[PDB]
Design a protein around this nucleic acid. Structure first.
Ligand SMILES: Nc1ncnc2c1ncn2[C@@H]1O[C@H](COP(=O)(O)OP(=O)(O)OP(=O)(O)OP(=O)(O)OC[C@H]2O[C@@H](n3ccc(=O)[nH]c3=O)[C@H](O)[C@@H]2O)[C@@H](O)[C@H]1O
Ligand SMILES: [Mg+2]
Ligand SMILES: [Mg+2]
Ligand SMILES: [Mg+2]
Ligand SMILES: [Zn+2]
Lengths: 221, 15, 1113, 263, 83, 94, 104
DNA sequence: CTTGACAAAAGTGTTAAATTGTGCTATACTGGGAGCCGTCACGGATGC
DNA sequence: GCATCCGTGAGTAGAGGGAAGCACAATTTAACACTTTTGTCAAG
């Protein structure tokens, strides 16, 4: 079983677990030799360990069996057709319930990740990780745009009334980060939900008129 | 000597 | 324009095919066209007969024959579809049951073998590649002295690489001889006992040399049985392993006597027989037959060692750097070596598959799994050091790449561990390896070139031709010989004077074992064919090479590879004579197969009616992009109805002019300083070069994009990109691709693509922003392909590949891929690099208008101004002589051919200048003009410098200056003459691949690394510049503390500092104070992973937190 | 363990080394609970010790652990921190920086000692944050965000942007660097002059200190940002202020080549 | 006692500067057992931590210099003294 | 060379002290919008623009020219740091 | 408040456990179909932190108002995602193992 | 400012379908395979 | 002395490169039917 993802010592240790199991279940009344019955358990333990520990991204045993069958089928077709088979040819030979779409999806699943320390070029100074940018942390340009938008938005809110500004800042979630519905806003201010609906819309329409006359908030969209 | 863990294990089980 | 030829040496043979090192070796390995019953035991045929038959030890698998099929796709299709040009391989096998005696035969499919093109290159995954030959130590038996102790020698037996271990025979200080295998030392007497040797046999053969035999006469091991000695030997070789005979005989036999594990090779066996004077039946150290081991080479090796120590005249040490002890492994041998490795793995799978599962019902097809064989072959052609991306900047570039010899690679030397001995020029390189062509730097002396006349023999040894001399007369018989055979003769020089075929000089310069001697004509046995056989092809293209220093000649030959094809390229005024053959052997141009008449001429095709009546149509390659980005095109050179003979030129290839190699332009040059614009190798050019489209080249760039399947949805190539105006979408067609013929600039869109944005929580601010404007968001974003900064041109081609197309093998999840080709015409500008064939190089620093350039008295301005300060220190006088011959040919309207070391001399050049003066000055007299007033003033100073003879007429003195290559030159700015005569002439200058437009780069902010959070590197990645350790030392020495802290934190990896710095500048403020860099935080965490506690403290030793409480529980 | 522009994943070698240690540690727990013989237990304990060694320092003892399907050793924690490619010499004593560029150099004979020639296209990117503020101050752009969108497309750049770029660099200096930097004179400060073209213009008198000629050499450009950084460069690092050799005291900027020949 | 340059640089007090030179494993092992503290005296250690180096404009001899015009000085001096 | 560089180096005991004085003074000018300058109206540095001749925006250039006049006082332990900024703000609102 | 010195010393087993936010019990990295981190693995969000700022692994909290809060269903703390560069875990060995630095 | 009174959206509960995890198979079978020298040359520290 | 072991060897750039199947039990996921929310159109 060597050369399938586990080292030789790892294979031996996993096989030893199967040998222990066979001792408990062995029955000597049948007059069969021990090696006849213990071979089944030793092979099973090694096979299950490979399907569980040989991949960085673990795949369920049922899908691992499907992948092995898919590769074995493709090899037989290749030596008969004299060329690499297509997805349609593999799917037809695979059996009922298989189409070319399922063949391609299975092959995508069976792809292993590549190392970040893989050397590129003959000189040993360049690696794969030297060409992968980071897309998670915001860039300095993106961070500065957010600050400019916030300071201009709060400047426009000052044109509204004191009560009108607070309604918009709560109904949109500019405090604590959470949007607040007409109920919790009403609970905080002691008013109904139909009243807040009108004043929230009323403050929105006054902002639209101001923006059209200056064009100070359009470039941010 | 003892640089091969596989050789070390084989000697032990041979006793 | 007539061509005048110089020279006296008459060459008896022409140059051999220049690519036969690649083409011939691969033909021998494949043996595709020879009938199977007549195939020799070489190449892959020998590999089949070595692994087969496969025996279970009763099932036997036997090999009968093989065949190769037609390639599935043509070469042009493979390049477009990223395929490999290869042919299928089938093997005819039979299975024999030893018990029953039943035989079944069937043909099994083994895989594909890459095919070599007609020019000698491969197409791997759609890309052109070249396999570079390897040089290494030849196998055999060698004898070297012991450096530690004088008077002692060591005998070594070297097999083929990865085909057995080395064996060392050494005499120990105690007198007992030792044999060392696999870093283990043991007495040779023990091994000799296994080989069935008695003391009487040993004493008879090796007892007549001295006291050495006394150490080979032990008696404790002697009386022991050879089988008992065999089990004792196995204990020493394999400590700890249980001592079983089946485990012991299977180890000794497989060490020195197994043809499947030990291979001396054809070269090694031949060398051993020649040195030891014996006849080897096989290629193994010993042969195992009749249950006993038989000696083959150990006794003759030990006999030579004992005799050498005694001091017999017939024994000598071996030089390991001697070219008779070094051989070449060609592409055919390198591929076969990997073929045998893959075949060995196939046999292992067959053996284990025939001992389990359906034993009675077995077929050869079921037993054979060809996947290990295909994997090993594809690895050699893709991920090997000797398999290199093809260099095709110009036709000469690809010719040189195929003739290079490398000492690196698997089984070779290492760039860092190579000493001075291997990098030096040996005396045996004469006529076999070029002494000047090599890369300066860490690869000097490790990568070389084959000589022009040299050729590799069947055993891998380089040979050079010589002319037989008998009785003092030179004959026309030519003999090719190796370095070891060459040492036995006295070989004269090719420049020896001859009266017909008889040597005329009484004193002859010759070589004896590499040393120069003076001998009489009666002592001469061989003669050199030509001076050209000493150098390579690139070096043979440099005229007046004998006047150039070797260091500068290295640059001249290397830089010819980097010349770019030009739209108006022309052949040099002064040539050496190899220009025609280089174009012919590169297969870049088109020639007539036989006599006929041209029927149809077009920019795309040529049709010729041959005499026998068949019609042949030749498609021409137009505007094709090479690996380097240069444009390769073929221009027809015939008309309809023109009669052509066999071999006549039909169409010129890249960098060729009427069948002559054309790597540059011929320009008028003045050698003089000019206002500091010639400072330190800088070059001044005229604007008139740009007006006539001189030094103009065409380049093509390729862009690619893909549409994939995603969990969120499929990417679509479309014209409907959100939030884009009509101006940006003007040049795209309905399918979202840019139309052919449109001009594109940086920031323009080449192909439009949309992606599904995915799920996310719009910031609260953007929530209000979108509510005010009443704009519902879309589910897709812009992911289109745009022109990178500093690029652009004209769209000339678009390629679209879709899933399910015939021959298109896309990766899983990929729907389609689009490729766009953009072409630009590049004119000469400031910063471009120019060079000539003598090693003079520089960049253009100034472009002047025509009225500013110095001009001749007739009004003709010069084109290029060169600084004379670059000549004296470099000692390359060939450019000066080329300029002098160029001036004479400018007025006479003729070109010249001067072979290296035998060509034009100063007396011949000065007589041509005399005729050129009669048309340069005689024309003026007829028109009615005398001598200029300004010319009189310059002549007055000329005699004060001793340049002209006083008392002569002004015309006679002007002729004296002309014979020295100097003319009176006027200043275009003032109209006054230069105070001294200036050397003016015609020179050949090339434009190099390195251009400023491909190297300028800048960045303010951009992508950052994943772990270190530092800016990436490289122009293609829009990266930043590296501020290394030595740069930090410079700022420290200046005392610029705040400047250094900015680069360490604010501009590299202080995330909070770099965000705040950007926002401060755009608001008109000053940058804030820096903070702790992110790289130091990574170092602390990595040290904690090693169970080390690293803590930052304060003035009072209290811990200070540098993680802002984000990691404190 | 990150996804890339395509669909495939990339991960570091440390994840494999951690997986081996966990797999062997968990197997020893199960073996102990089953009352396995001492021979089996002793093999597992020896394998656990070797797994810890590979994670900390791979290859120090025994054969190095390699990934299946290849002969390349896995990078351990010790390999990350040590060597020329380690954390210290590659990321702590030296870094890649922003506001930097590179181009081919040519000779400028008309420049003063304290001047250099900077291409306009390079200067636009090098001083981009300063230029966006300047365009906003004038009527070129309404805001910084709209100003940045204009510079994205080459055909969208008006002629008034180049006038604003002149005002931005007024009085500022940049740093020029040529590798290898043998001494501190390999970095000097110059007052840039905007030129048409793509190559940097270098004063003839500073070539000897840089050991630079004009047969293909390139150079790097850096921009000091703050007032402190500008003051240090203009006072301590200006080319016109460093005329004598720090090693011997003899002049280092002096006539040479054609200048000596003419005089 | 007399030492070479390599041995003298490896015996310095600061473990941060010694570890970045060479023999990093040996340096770190000895420093960890002894519990060494680095006082950040030289130039290399301040570069690693991104701090201002104690030389040039970063030296304590000139770092704390103040600049003020006479108009501000006269107002500052008088206001505090007369009060 | 910077104008008056020889005279500036002769005003300080250490050449790095001159850089500190210039850099700190330049920050003061930028903070108060050049309203705290000690230069006369005819002594202000100017730059040539297409529209006309305007004030020099480079604060380091202003600081070097102010030091040559001799109206600036520099040294260590001159005034308390807090007292300096608060007094400057009251005299030069910005 | 300013760093003035750096100390290096040995770490006890008790100190190593005080650094860790949890024990890694499985070698699994991420799920093969969802591509999400697996529980008790080398990338678990309950140990090292959330993938994105202020969002648990069960889609119940998505706001900054719950600063320093731990979800009662998934156990992921509602905080910044940058903590995944600083938070460490630990593995409890069945038998002690020596440090190779102090041996070789 | 509020009540009413829908209408779509968000929330909840149940459940079948899909996916994932775990145990077992009785002729007899009982110590690995791969590698192969221009083995890099030179100080420095340590063990004996 | 002399044998054994161990760490060290200039910088920047580019440019290619990149081998079983089955049954059965738990467990998770997706579809779908009510049901409380919560924004809204219209008065007053
Ligand atoms: N303006 C002046 N410029 C120069 N010297 C002037 C001047 N004025 C007065 N002097 C005086 O003259 C003496 C020199 O006189 P000289 O005749 O010997 O000079 P030269 O003509 O040979 O020019 P040079 O550039 O040295 O040639 P090179 O070796 O090919 O340069 C290749 C360069 O590439 C670099 N490189 C290469 C490969 C590699 O792996 N790593 C690597 O870093 C490396 O930087 C190398 O240097 C001077 O000391 C001075 O006192
Ligand atoms: Mg090179
Ligand atoms: Mg030079
Ligand atoms: Mg140069
Ligand atoms: Zn949750």
């Amino acid at each position: 079983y060597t050369g399938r993802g586990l080292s030789f010592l790892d294979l031996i240790q996993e096989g030893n677990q199967g040998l222990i199991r066979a001792v408990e279940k062995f029955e000597y009344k049948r007059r069969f030799k021990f090696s006849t019955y213990a071979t089944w358990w030793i092979r099973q333990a090694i096979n299950r360990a490979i399907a569980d520990q040989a991949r960085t991204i673990r795949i369920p045993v049922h899908m691992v069996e499907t992948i092995n069958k898919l590769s074995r089928t493709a090899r037989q077709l290749q030596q008969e057709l004299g060329r690499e088979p297509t997805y349609e040819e593999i799917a037809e030979a695979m059996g009922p319930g298989w189409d070319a779409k399922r063949v391609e999806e299975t092959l995508k699943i069976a792809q292993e990740p590549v190392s970040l320390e893989t050397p590129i070029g003959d000189e040993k100074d360049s690696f794969y990780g030297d060409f992968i940018p980071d897309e998670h942390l915001p860039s300095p340009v993106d961070a500065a745009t957010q600050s400019l938008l916030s300071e201009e938005l709060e400047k426009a809110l000052s044109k509204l009334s004191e009560r009108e500004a607070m309604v918009l800042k709560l109904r949109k979630g500019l405090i604590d980060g959470r949007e607040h519905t007409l109920e919790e806003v009403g609970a905080f201010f002691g008013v109904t939900r139909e009243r807040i609906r009108q004043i929230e819309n009323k403050a929105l329409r006054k902002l639209k008129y101001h923006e059209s006359r200056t064009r100070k908030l359009r470039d941010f969209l | 000597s003892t640089s091969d863990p596989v050789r070390q294990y084989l000697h032990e089980i041979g006793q | 324009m007539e061509i005048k030829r110089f020279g006296r040496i008459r060459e008896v043979i022409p140059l051999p095919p220049l690519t036969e090192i690649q083409v011939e070796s691969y033909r021998r390995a494949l043996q595709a066209d020879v009938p199977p019953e007549k195939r020799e035991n070489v190449g892959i045929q020998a590999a089949f007969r070595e692994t087969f038959p496969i025996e279970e030890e009763g099932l036997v698998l036997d090999f009968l024959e093989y065949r190769l099929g037609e390639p599935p796709f043509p070469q042009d299709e493979c390049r477009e579809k990223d395929l490999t040009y290869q042919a299928p391989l089938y093997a005819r096998l039979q299975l024999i049951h030893k018990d029953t005696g039943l035989i079944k035969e069937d043909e099994v499919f083994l895989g594909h073998i890459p095919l070599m093109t007609e020019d000698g290159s491969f197409i791997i995954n759609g890309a052109d590649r070249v396999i570079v030959s390897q040089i290494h130590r030849s196998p055999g038996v060698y004898f070297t002295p012991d450096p530690a102790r004088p008077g002692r020698y060591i005998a070594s037996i070297i097999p083929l690489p990865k085909r057995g271990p080395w064996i060392d025979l050494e005499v120990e200080p105690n007198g007992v001889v030792s044999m060392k295998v696999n870093k283990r030392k043991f007495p040779l007497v023990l091994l000799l006992r296994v080989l069935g040797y008695d003391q009487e046999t040993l004493a008879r053969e090796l007892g007549a040399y001295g006291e050495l035999v006394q150490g080979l006469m032990d008696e404790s091991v002697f009386a022991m049985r050879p089988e008992e000695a065999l089990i004792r030997l196995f204990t020493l070789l394999r400590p700890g392993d249980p001592p079983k005979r089946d485990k012991a005989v299977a180890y000794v036999y497989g060490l020195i006597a197994d043809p499947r594990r030990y291979d001396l090779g054809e070269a090694g066996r031949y060398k051993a027989e020649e040195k030891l004077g014996i006849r080897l039946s096989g290629r193994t150290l010993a042969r195992f037959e009749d249950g006993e081991f038989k000696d083959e080479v150990f006794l003759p090796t030990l006999r030579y060692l004992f005799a050498l120590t005694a001091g017999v005249p017939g024994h000598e040490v071996d030089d390991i750097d001697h070219l008779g002890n070094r051989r070449i492994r060609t592409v055919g041998e390198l591929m076969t070596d990997q073929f045998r490795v893959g075949l060995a793995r196939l046999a292992r799978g067959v053996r284990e598959r025939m001992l389990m599962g359906s034993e009675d019902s077995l077929t050869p097809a079921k037993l054979v799994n060809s996947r290990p064989l295909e994997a090993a072959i594809r690895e050699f052609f893709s991920r090997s050091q000797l398999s290199q991306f093809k260099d095709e900047t110009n036709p000469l570039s690809s010719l040189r790449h195929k003739r290079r010899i490398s000492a690196l690679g698997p089984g070779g030397l290492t760039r860092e561990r190579a000493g001075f001995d291997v990098r030096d020029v040996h005396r045996t390189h004469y006529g076999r390896i070029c002494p000047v062509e090599t890369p300066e730097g860490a690869n000097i002396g490790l990568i070389t070139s084959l000589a022009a006349y040299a050729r590799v023999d069947e055993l891998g040894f380089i040979r050079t031709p010589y002319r037989r001399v008998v009785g003092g007369v030179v004959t026309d018989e030519v003999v090719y010989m190796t370095a070891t055979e060459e040492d036995r003769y006295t070989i004269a020089q090719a420049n020896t004077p001859l009266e017909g075929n008889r040597i005329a000089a009484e004193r002859v310069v010759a070589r004896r074992k590499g040393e120069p001697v003076i001998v009489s004509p009666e002592e001469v046995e061989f003669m050199d064919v030509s001076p050209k056989q000493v150098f390579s092809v690139n070096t043979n293209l440099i005229p007046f090479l004998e006047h150039d220093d070797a260091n500068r000649a290295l640059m001249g030959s290397n830089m010819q590879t980097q010349a770019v094809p030009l739209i108006r390229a022309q052949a040099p005024v002064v040539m050496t004579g190899l220009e025609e053959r280089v174009v012919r052997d590169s297969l870049a141009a088109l020639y007539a197969e036989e006599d006929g008449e041209v029927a149809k001429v077009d920019g795309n095709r040529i049709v010729v009616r041959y005499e026998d009546g068949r019609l042949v149509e030749y498609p021409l390659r137009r505007f094709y992009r090479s690996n380097q980005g240069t444009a390769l095109d073929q221009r027809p050179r015939v008309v309809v109805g023109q009669r052509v003979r066999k071999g006549d030129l039909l169409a010129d290839g890249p960098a060729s002019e009427n069948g002559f190699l054309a790597l540059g332009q011929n320009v008028l040059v003045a050698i003089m300083p000019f206002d500091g614009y010639n400072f330190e190798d800088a070059i001044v050019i005229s604007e008139e070069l740009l007006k006539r489209d001189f030094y103009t080249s065409i380049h093509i760039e390729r862009y690619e994009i893909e549409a994939r399947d995603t969990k969120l949805g499929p990417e679509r190539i479309t014209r409907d990109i959100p939030h884009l105006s009509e101006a940006a979408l003007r040049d795209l067609d309905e399918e979202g691709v840019v139309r052919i013929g449109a001009e594109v600039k940086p920031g323009d869109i080449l192909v439009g693509r949309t992606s599904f944005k995915g799920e996310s929580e719009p910031t609260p601010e953007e929530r209000l922003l979108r509510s005010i404007f009443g704009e519902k968001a879309r589910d897709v974003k812009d992911t289109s392909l745009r022109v990178p900064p500093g690029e652009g041109g004209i769209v000339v081609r678009t390629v679209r590949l879709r899933r399910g197309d015939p021959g298109v093998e896309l990766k899983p999840g990929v729907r389609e891929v689009v490729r766009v080709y953009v072409a630009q015409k590049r004119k000469l500008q400031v910063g471009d690099k120019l060079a000539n064939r003598h090693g003079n190089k520089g960049v253009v620093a100034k472009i002047l208008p025509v009225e500013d350039m110095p001009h001749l008295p007739d009004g003709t301005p010069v084109d290029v101004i060169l600084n004379p300060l670059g000549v004296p220190s470099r000692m390359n006088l060939g450019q000066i002589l080329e300029t002098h011959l160029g001036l004479a040919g400018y007025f006479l309207g003729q070109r010249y051919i001067s072979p290296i070391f035998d060509g034009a001399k100063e007396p011949e050049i000065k007589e041509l200048l005399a005729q050129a003066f009669e048309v340069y000055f005689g024309k003026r007299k007829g028109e009615g003009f005398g001598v200029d007033k300004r010319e009189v003033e310059v002549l007055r100073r000329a005699e004060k410098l001793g340049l002209v003879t006083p008392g002569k007429t002004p015309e006679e003195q002007l002729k004296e200056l002309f014979l020295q290559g100097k003319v009176v030159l006027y200043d275009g700015r003032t109209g006054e003459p230069i105070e001294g005569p200036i050397v003016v002439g015609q020179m050949f200058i090339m434009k190099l691949y390195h251009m400023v437009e491909d190297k300028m780069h800048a960045r303010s902010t951009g992508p950052y690394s994943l772990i270190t959070q530092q800016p990436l590197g490289g122009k293609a990645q829009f990266g930043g510049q590296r501020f290394g350790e030595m740069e930090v030392w410079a700022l420290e020495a200046y005392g610029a503390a705040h400047t250094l802290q900015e680069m360490l934190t604010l501009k590299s990896d202080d995330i909070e500092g770099r965000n705040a710095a950007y926002e401060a500048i755009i608001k008109g403020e000053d940058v804030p104070e820096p903070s702790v860099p992110e790289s130091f935080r990574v170092l602390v965490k990595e040290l904690q992973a090693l169970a080390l506690d690293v803590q930052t403290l304060d003035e009072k030793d209290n811990p200070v937190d540098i993680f802002e409480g984000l990691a404190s529980k | 363990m990150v996804q890339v522009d395509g669909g495939r994943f990339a991960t570091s070698d440390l994840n494999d080394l951690y997986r081996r240690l966990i797999n062997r540690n968990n197997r020893l727990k199960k073996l102990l609970a089953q009352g396995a013989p001492e021979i089996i237990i002793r093999n597992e304990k020896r394998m656990l010790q070797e797994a810890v060694d590979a994670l900390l320092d791979n290859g120090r003892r025994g054969a190095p652990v390699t990934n299946p399907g290849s002969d390349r050793p896995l990078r351990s924690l010790t390999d990350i921190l040590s060597g020329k490619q380690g954390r210290f010499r590659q990321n702590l004593l030296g870094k890649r920086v922003d506001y930097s560029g590179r181009s081919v150099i040519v000779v400028g004979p008309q420049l003063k000692l304290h001047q250099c020639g900077l291409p306009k296209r390079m200067a636009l990117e090098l001083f981009k944050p300063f230029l966006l503020k300047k365009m906003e101050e004038k009527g070129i752009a309404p805001n910084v965000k709209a100003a940045r969108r204009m510079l994205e497309r080459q055909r969208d750049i008006k002629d008034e942007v180049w006038d604003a770029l002149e005002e931005v660099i007024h009085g500022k200096v940049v740093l020029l660097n040529r590798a290898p930097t043998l001494h501190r004179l390999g970095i000097q400060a110059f007052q840039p002059v905007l030129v048409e073209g793509q190559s940097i213009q270098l004063h003839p008198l500073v070539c000897e200190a840089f050991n630079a000629d004009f047969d293909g050499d390139q150079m790097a450009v850096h921009v000091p940002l703050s007032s402190f950084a500008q003051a240090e460069a203009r006072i301590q690092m200006l080319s016109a202020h460093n005329l004598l050799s720090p090693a011997s005291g003899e002049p280092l900027a002096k006539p040479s080549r054609d200048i000596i020949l003419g005089l | 006692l007399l030492m070479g340059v390599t041995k003298s640089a490896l015996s310095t007090k600061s473990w941060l500067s010694a570890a970045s030179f060479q023999n990093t494993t040996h340096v770190l092992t000895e420093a960890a057992i002894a519990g060494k503290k680095d006082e950040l005296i030289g130039l290399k250690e301040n570069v690693i931590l991104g701090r201002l180096i104690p030389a040039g404009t970063g030296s304590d001899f000139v770092r704390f210099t103040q600049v003020v015009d006479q108009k501000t000085l006269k107002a500052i001096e008088e206001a505090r003294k007369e009060a | 060379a910077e104008p008056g560089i020889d005279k500036l180096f002769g005003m300080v005991d250490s050449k790095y002290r001159l850089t500190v004085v210039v850099a700190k003074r330049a920050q003061q000018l930028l903070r108060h919008g050049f309203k705290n300058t000690v230069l006369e109206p005819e002594e202000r540095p100017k730059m040539q623009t297409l529209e006309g001749l305007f004030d020099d925006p480079n604060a380091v250039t202003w600081a070097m020219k102010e030091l040559l006049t001799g109206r600036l006082v520099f040294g260590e332990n001159l005034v308390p740091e807090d007292r300096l900024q608060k007094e400057m703000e009251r005299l030069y609102p910005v | 408040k300013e760093v003035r010195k750096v100390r290096i010393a040995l770490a006890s087993p008790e100190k190593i456990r005080s650094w860790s936010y949890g024990e890694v019990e499985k070698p699994e990295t991420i799920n093969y179909r969802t591509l999400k981190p697996e529980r008790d693995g080398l990338f678990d969000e309950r140990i090292f932190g959330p993938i994105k700022d202020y969002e648990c692994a069960c889609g119940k909290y998505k706001r900054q108002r719950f600063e320093g809060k731990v979800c009662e269903r998934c156990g992921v703390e509602v905080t910044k995602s940058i903590v995944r560069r600083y938070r460490m875990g630990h593995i409890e060995l069945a038998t002690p193992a020596a440090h190779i630095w102090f041996v070789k």
